[PDB]
Amino acid sequence: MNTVPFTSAPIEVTIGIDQYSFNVKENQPFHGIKDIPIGHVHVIHFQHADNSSMRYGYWFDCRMGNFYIQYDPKDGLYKMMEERDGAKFENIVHNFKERQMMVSYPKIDEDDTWYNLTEFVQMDKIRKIVRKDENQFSYVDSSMTTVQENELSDPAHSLNYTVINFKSREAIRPGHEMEDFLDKSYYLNTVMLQGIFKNSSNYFGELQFAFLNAMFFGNYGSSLQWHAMIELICSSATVPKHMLDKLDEILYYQIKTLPEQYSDILLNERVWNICLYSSFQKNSLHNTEKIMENKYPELL
Amino acid sequence: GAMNSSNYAELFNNDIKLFVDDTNVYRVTVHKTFEGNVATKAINGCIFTLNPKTGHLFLKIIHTSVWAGQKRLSQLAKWKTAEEVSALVRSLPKEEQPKQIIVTRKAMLDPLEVHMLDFPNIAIRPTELRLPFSAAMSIDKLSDVVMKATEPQMVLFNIYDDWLDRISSYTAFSRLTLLLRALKTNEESAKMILLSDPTITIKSYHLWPSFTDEQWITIESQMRDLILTEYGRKYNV
Ligand SMILES: Nc1ncccc1CO
């Protein structure tokens, strides 16, 4: 188990760690989060009590170093930093634990929710989508734009998602115009799976990453990316059998974990109804179909 | 954006554009089988591709053989239309290629867009206008060359005959849409009007009769009257 200590908490803020969150009062004696499960990536995120605008946060993997949070009063936000001096860091942590000023990552033992949401998410791959190579952790916020959004302005602050475009030359083979547009299997299997992502694990990794950024930060271009990667699969007549079964599990836990009051802006009516009721794979998403109907039957 | 009553006049500026109408591409007679089931038999169709400024009509005849052994023909027809329109553009010299293509039915947008990916600077536009181009098969010479075709074939016409020697594109397009609106709403009456006088003839190289300017006004009037009456009948007003 690992720890992310906080220097202090000077401004009142809601802090999330994965799917958990805690309210911290201005200058309350808060000094970090302990008992963080090793072996998965994690995200620690923030929403200030005074500007409910700009949710922001850090993707990180505790196996890649010692990380802490420090408020910056010039830039006005909680920053993630790496401590390179290992003894200095254990010392800080042990002292804060001894004073019981840390919250415990509150995982129920029966619960596999976070595993299931982050199964294919890889921290080393996260750093190729969020490019800032002097840090081992990755910053994301509500407002950041994706590479594709920028095409249709600052490249350093961009989410480099895999551009997916159903009316593009990458998607449509010359002479198979109709074939490839109505059955995207060529684009899924040859262009994207074999060409770009190399395997399905990677594809699912980006898809889960995009969903988590949409849910935790309300990042709109991430939501567009998650829906696009679902639609590419659902619009392919030929999908490996193991991918369909795993897709159903992925989407189930994403729909399960969504706040009930956010389905209006995070869920795209057209994509879901087409994936569940019109597409080739309309019959291959039993769990995801069952949870969608019992929990959001309005959308459909 | 979409073409409508408000940007109507853009059709007659000097940027090349084409209308594409696919209504008559896939044509069937529906009939009964020996066992009492219903079956379709296709007949030849055409793509109606028109430059509204010049009157040049690119009539691509769609021979029934293009449907042989194919499923979901009404869906295929939209892609075949898009394939043929794209092939036409590629066949034209660069300075003759359109800057816009306006499809008369919105279901053509995606098929045409995908087929024209090689021409990113050609705008594919829908329209809110209810244009009467389905009535093109009520023009005898167009109907005749489509039905007689024994293979795929492109036939070129000027749908305005020689009208542009005497009138502008705007007025010629209005005359054309009025003639086609009348033919669409009551073909029998519409055609009675155009040929009633055996002394007015159609030149071998034309589609419509050689009316003087004054006879065109009498014609156009008679075509309006037909269109209104039919409307009171249609709706009882
Ligand atoms: N595997 C992944 N995990 C997180 C972001 C992106 C990818 C795709 O390479």
XYZ file of N, CA and C in Angstrom, chain A residues 69-167:
297
model
N 1.189 16.254 -2.965
C 0.438 17.445 -3.384
C 0.826 18.666 -2.544
N 0.955 19.823 -3.194
C 1.286 21.078 -2.522
C 0.459 22.166 -3.176
N -0.234 22.986 -2.383
C -0.974 24.108 -2.966
C -0.005 25.207 -3.386
N -0.236 25.772 -4.585
C 0.547 26.875 -5.143
C -0.290 28.148 -5.075
N 0.042 29.142 -4.252
C -0.837 30.323 -4.157
C -0.685 31.310 -5.310
N 0.323 31.110 -6.167
C 0.493 31.959 -7.360
C -0.392 31.462 -8.507
N -0.313 30.162 -8.799
C -1.137 29.543 -9.827
C -2.494 29.095 -9.309
N -2.696 29.030 -8.007
C -4.041 28.844 -7.508
C -4.534 27.436 -7.662
N -3.675 26.471 -7.463
C -4.215 25.124 -7.512
C -3.283 24.157 -6.819
N -3.839 22.991 -6.524
C -3.125 21.898 -5.882
C -2.287 21.196 -6.936
N -0.976 21.185 -6.753
C -0.090 20.659 -7.778
C 0.443 19.309 -7.316
N 0.620 18.377 -8.243
C 1.317 17.143 -7.907
C 2.806 17.349 -8.139
N 3.625 16.772 -7.264
C 5.079 16.860 -7.356
C 5.687 15.515 -7.000
N 6.918 15.282 -7.447
C 7.655 14.070 -7.110
C 8.761 14.412 -6.122
N 8.874 13.617 -5.061
C 9.976 13.717 -4.112
C 11.014 12.676 -4.510
N 12.226 13.125 -4.852
C 13.263 12.192 -5.292
C 14.024 11.563 -4.121
N 14.082 12.250 -2.978
C 14.804 11.799 -1.784
C 13.932 10.823 -1.005
N 14.195 9.526 -1.160
C 13.296 8.523 -0.604
C 13.199 8.553 0.913
N 14.310 8.811 1.592
C 14.276 8.835 3.051
C 13.515 10.053 3.556
N 13.730 11.205 2.920
C 12.956 12.393 3.248
C 11.459 12.140 3.127
N 11.044 11.294 2.174
C 9.625 11.067 1.896
C 9.005 10.091 2.894
N 9.679 8.970 3.172
C 9.172 8.067 4.201
C 9.042 8.806 5.523
N 9.997 9.701 5.798
C 10.011 10.447 7.049
C 8.801 11.353 7.156
N 8.531 12.116 6.099
C 7.339 12.959 6.071
C 6.093 12.109 6.271
N 6.005 10.992 5.556
C 4.796 10.181 5.611
C 4.617 9.578 7.001
N 5.649 8.901 7.506
C 5.524 8.263 8.810
C 5.065 9.256 9.879
N 5.597 10.479 9.854
C 5.154 11.505 10.793
C 3.672 11.831 10.624
N 3.203 11.984 9.381
C 1.803 12.357 9.189
C 0.875 11.209 9.586
N 1.237 9.963 9.252
C 0.468 8.822 9.746
C 0.415 8.819 11.268
N 1.573 8.989 11.912
C 1.629 8.926 13.371
C 0.657 9.918 13.994
N 0.484 11.078 13.364
C -0.483 12.074 13.813
C -1.883 11.839 13.254
N -2.087 10.744 12.519
C -3.415 10.325 12.069
C -4.134 11.454 11.355
N -3.377 12.190 10.561
C -3.935 13.285 9.775
C -4.195 12.863 8.337
N -4.335 11.556 8.064
C -4.540 11.096 6.692
C -5.786 10.234 6.561
N -6.518 10.405 5.465
C -7.658 9.542 5.157
C -7.147 8.253 4.530
N -7.919 7.182 4.697
C -7.577 5.863 4.188
C -8.356 5.600 2.903
N -7.645 5.223 1.836
C -8.313 4.865 0.593
C -9.360 3.798 0.958
N -10.650 4.080 0.784
C -11.677 3.292 1.460
C -12.232 2.187 0.589
N -11.389 1.198 0.295
C -11.776 0.089 -0.556
C -12.433 -1.014 0.267
N -13.693 -1.305 -0.068
C -14.361 -2.526 0.365
C -13.711 -3.723 -0.314
N -13.522 -4.806 0.446
C -12.789 -5.954 -0.082
C -13.581 -6.693 -1.158
N -14.911 -6.660 -1.078
C -15.761 -7.285 -2.087
C -15.717 -6.547 -3.416
N -15.252 -5.308 -3.416
C -15.436 -4.405 -4.535
C -14.273 -4.511 -5.516
N -14.587 -4.797 -6.786
C -13.608 -4.748 -7.855
C -13.878 -3.577 -8.810
N -14.628 -2.575 -8.371
C -15.002 -1.505 -9.291
C -13.790 -0.858 -9.942
N -12.799 -0.409 -9.162
C -11.715 0.346 -9.799
C -10.908 -0.529 -10.752
N -10.603 -1.759 -10.336
C -9.962 -2.687 -11.257
C -10.738 -2.734 -12.560
N -12.057 -2.876 -12.463
C -12.821 -3.107 -13.690
C -12.850 -1.852 -14.566
N -12.752 -0.665 -13.969
C -12.740 0.578 -14.758
C -11.387 0.893 -15.385
N -10.303 0.311 -14.858
C -8.928 0.631 -15.243
C -8.151 -0.616 -15.696
N -8.823 -1.693 -16.044
C -8.165 -2.973 -16.416
C -7.063 -2.860 -17.473
N -7.270 -2.072 -18.517
C -6.343 -1.892 -19.669
C -5.651 -0.551 -19.690
N -5.989 0.323 -18.734
C -5.433 1.693 -18.686
C -3.971 1.506 -18.312
N -3.025 2.046 -19.057
C -1.621 1.852 -18.692
C -0.939 3.214 -18.383
N -0.261 3.392 -17.216
C 0.265 4.831 -16.927
C 1.244 5.280 -18.001
N 2.162 4.413 -18.417
C 3.123 4.715 -19.502
C 2.373 5.096 -20.810
N 1.202 4.541 -21.102
C 0.430 4.918 -22.302
C -0.262 6.271 -22.045
N -0.782 6.507 -20.815
C -1.435 7.805 -20.408
C -0.508 8.960 -20.805
N 0.816 8.884 -20.557
C 1.870 9.910 -20.844
C 2.096 10.185 -22.340
N 1.610 9.326 -23.224
C 1.664 9.551 -24.687
C 0.376 10.267 -25.055
N -0.691 10.107 -24.305
C -1.889 10.906 -24.642
C -1.738 12.314 -24.034
N -1.180 12.425 -22.824
C -0.952 13.720 -22.115
C 0.545 13.904 -22.136
N 1.096 14.748 -23.001
C 2.559 14.766 -23.249
C 3.256 15.805 -22.361
N 3.895 15.377 -21.297
C 4.678 16.284 -20.460
C 5.775 15.464 -19.804
N 6.846 15.229 -20.554
C 7.746 14.127 -20.235
C 8.638 14.381 -19.031
N 8.699 15.605 -18.511
C 9.469 15.832 -17.295
C 8.738 15.365 -16.038
N 7.482 14.931 -16.151
C 6.738 14.405 -15.022
C 6.296 12.969 -15.288
N 6.267 12.171 -14.226
C 5.826 10.782 -14.265
C 4.328 10.626 -14.093
N 3.641 11.715 -13.728
C 2.210 11.779 -13.503
C 1.616 12.713 -14.554
N 0.306 12.613 -14.775
C -0.338 13.391 -15.840
C -1.498 14.252 -15.368
N -1.471 15.550 -15.755
C -2.511 16.523 -15.424
C -3.606 16.527 -16.466
N -4.853 16.481 -16.024
C -6.002 16.647 -16.902
C -7.002 17.594 -16.247
N -7.729 18.369 -17.071
C -8.829 19.181 -16.551
C -10.025 19.292 -17.486
N -11.080 19.919 -16.938
C -12.348 20.099 -17.641
C -12.196 20.694 -19.039
N -11.240 21.609 -19.220
C -11.228 22.483 -20.384
C -10.309 21.995 -21.496
N -9.386 21.076 -21.213
C -8.417 20.660 -22.229
C -9.103 20.109 -23.476
N -8.547 20.435 -24.636
C -9.085 19.979 -25.900
C -8.248 18.843 -26.442
N -8.874 18.076 -27.330
C -8.253 16.934 -27.975
C -7.627 17.367 -29.293
N -6.720 16.531 -29.794
C -6.080 16.834 -31.070
C -7.139 17.007 -32.163
N -8.100 16.076 -32.236
C -9.148 16.159 -33.250
C -9.979 17.429 -33.103
N -10.380 17.786 -31.874
C -11.114 19.041 -31.697
C -10.308 20.219 -32.252
N -8.992 20.229 -31.989
C -8.144 21.341 -32.423
C -8.114 21.464 -33.951
N -8.189 20.336 -34.674
C -8.169 20.374 -36.139
C -9.363 21.145 -36.705
N -10.557 20.929 -36.148
C -11.784 21.511 -36.695
C -12.109 22.877 -36.088
N -6.167 25.500 -29.243
C -5.164 25.857 -30.236
C -3.735 25.592 -29.746
N -3.559 25.389 -28.431
C -2.229 25.223 -27.849
C -1.876 23.743 -27.790
N -0.906 23.265 -28.583
C -0.679 21.809 -28.652
C -0.177 21.192 -27.356
N 0.514 21.961 -26.510
C 1.132 21.399 -25.315
C 0.108 20.965 -24.279
N -1.078 21.584 -24.329
C -2.201 21.367 -23.376
C -3.307 20.471 -23.963
N -2.962 19.537 -24.865
C -3.894 18.718 -25.666
C -4.046 17.274 -25.227
N -5.216 16.664 -25.381
C -5.318 15.204 -25.208
C -5.131 14.596 -26.618
N -4.037 13.849 -26.812
C -3.681 13.166 -28.087
C -4.445 11.863 -28.181
N -5.770 12.098 -28.541
C -6.411 10.732 -28.615
C -6.237 10.250 -30.073
N -6.469 8.971 -30.271
C -6.446 8.316 -31.590
C -7.577 8.990 -32.409
N -7.262 9.796 -33.409
C -8.321 10.427 -34.250
C -9.096 9.302 -34.918
N -10.381 9.273 -34.714
C -11.348 8.402 -35.352
C -12.310 9.290 -36.126
N -12.509 8.975 -37.400
C -13.346 9.810 -38.267
C -13.983 8.905 -39.320
N -15.297 8.703 -39.244
C -15.936 7.689 -40.077
C -16.047 8.118 -41.526
N -15.860 9.398 -41.826
C -15.918 9.871 -43.221
C -14.550 10.439 -43.559
